[model samples]
Target: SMSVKKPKRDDSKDLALCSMILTEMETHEDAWPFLLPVNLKLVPGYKKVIKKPMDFSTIREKLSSGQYPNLETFALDVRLVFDNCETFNEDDSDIGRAGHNMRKYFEKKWTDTFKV
Candidate 1:
């Protein structure tokens, strides 16, 4: 039927917050590496190392489509992007460095905004 499901009262607020955070992340300079899914051809074995790949674009789409039922789920996906990067890239590597910076940035924003 393709009917649109309405977001719950609380979900609406959570989604709005999530969308704002996503925009902030997308604009960050260090976001380039996490902007899209890792290129399997360019980065060999990424698929094997990161079983569940995540990216900012994917998170944005999910947020816009209301795929995340709550803020926790949205945060989880956001963290996954950085977690995967840490696992696949070395801490001193370019991508790894960016991942660490981005993760720190996000965590601070999250804590400051949600106090959680």
Candidate 2:
């Protein structure tokens, strides 16, 4: 018999961190840079598709929905955002820094409540 128990989920922590990221993003004038269309420069109308901030509201909702399952999984997604920022930025631009901060913030929060 495989008798393994799952680690207790910290829903409060997850929701708080997710909300924090969403709230922080709300102050931005644009949605995530990576979320923009690939040919935005070539197609002028593409910008209009993401004209509203609500374009990314789904992200906040999803994050708040316990879709991460665990802290490690959450960290992976957060890392992707930072990696994307670096990939898109001009050598550690503000966008990259912000992403880095988000990753660090999540790491700190996770550490505060769990081992590793």
Candidate 3:
């Protein structure tokens, strides 16, 4: 006999919100560094340091493909991009500052949109 499972809740709202936020982020001035994956050849040892390299392009692809089942999972990947940047660059550096700005923008947007 097969065990019963609960049905998945509708995620249309979360999907739309995520898409909107992603578009804004992509257009932000500091988004250049994160629009795509870090250059492995130029930034040597990045692969070793950042075990899970996350970027906007990857996130967009995942979102488009419906890989994220919930908003929290989508948020986690978004945060990962900034977190990885902090780990790789100094806070005073341009890239580091961009990460900080991006993170701030994302959190504010998230709270405003979700009221959480």
Candidate 4:
């Protein structure tokens, strides 16, 4: 049996970012359900993107593999997804409202990191 070797790199940033996202999710518990299952079009073969659960295990795997090089960029990328979401950005929908709140949460956290 072959064992997988984890990459050796600085993960403090990734861990911090991931932790913040999870913590912020808790801050918006009332709309937590709307945020849990993030719909992604990253999937193939289907023009219509479907709602898939946000897998924390997978997120941690990505961090371990160094898939995300920058925390701020990842934050922006995720916000873009939510901002572009037709359903979540609908303004009238509960999910949309919650999505914006989450978006702002990430933005504030990101900005706070650069405080002088």
Candidate 5:
């Protein structure tokens, strides 16, 4: 079985970026991008090409077909972190709005990234 390795948490730059993301997510719903950074070392604007309104239909089809192994393997390439997991609703929380904004942010980014 293959093991999923976490990204390295090393060096001041990485540490500083992680700290910044954690702090920002407290208030920013679009902070999901910072928390889950994608590797587009060669491809520019890759995130924007996907996660768009038009692309969502395709994504859903793929998801339903079980083409993706899991959320981490699936979203790791697109900047989404957790997927197919249980999400609990908390009382007195604006999580719904936060998630909505996060989805929009990713969609815009994905569209922008690929020029789609």
Candidate 6:
């Protein structure tokens, strides 16, 4: 999730929030993922960012092998989305707050993919 200008009551909690937000971001859907939501179901960069960070090397390897031609487009789209982050952060963007809920929504999807 995003952050309030001031820290929350506790610094440790604040750090946890930041970690959670970053981890959650790994699932983001860039521009092109919209075209094939179902196809890219388990794919990264389809939501906003899903895990804390991304394995760019893995993405790059995929790009190198041509498994995902749109990888470049996806990364560009994600970058563009973040291009105005400073502006988005100027006041308060509830976008990150909204992201917190996304994790709940995807739990069902995660269960389907990971469980028997």
TM-score of 6: 0.24
Write down the lDDT of every candidate, Cα atoms only. Answer: 0.88, 0.54, 0.94, 0.54, 0.39, 0.37
- Candidate 3, residue 81: Cα displacement in angstroms equals 0.5
State every prediction's TM-score relative to the real structure.
Answer: 0.86, 0.49, 0.88, 0.54, 0.29, 0.24
Rank candidates by lDDT, best first: 3, 1, 4, 2, 5, 6
Which 10-residue window of candidate 1 scores lowest in summed lDDT?
A: 6-15
* Structure candidate 5, residue pairs in collision: 45-113, 47-110, 48-109, 48-110, 48-111, 48-113, 49-110, 49-114
- Per-residue CA lDDT of model 6 for 24-99, tens digit only, reads 4444552122122222356444445432223333333434554543323434433433332222333243544333
In terms of TM-score, how similar is model 1 to the real structure? 0.86
Q: Assess the local accuracy of residue 46 in candidate 6 as a C-alpha lDDT between 0 and 100.
A: 41
Number of clashing pairs, model 1?
A: 0
Which runs in model 5 stand beyond 4 Å of their true positions? 1-86, 90-92
* Model 5 C-alpha lDDT per residue in residues 1-94, reported as the tens digit of each score: 2687877443334323323333433345444333433445654554454343212333444545656554433344233321211022232345
Worst 10 residues of 4 by lDDT: 45-54
TM-score winner between candidates 2 and 5: 2
Model 2 Cα displacement at 43 (Å)? 9.2
Better of 4 and 5 by lDDT: 4
TM-score of 4: 0.54
Top-TM-score candidate index:
3
The clash number for model 2 is 0
User: What TM-score number comes out for model 2?
Assistant: 0.49
> For candidate 4, what is the total of clashing residue pairs?
1
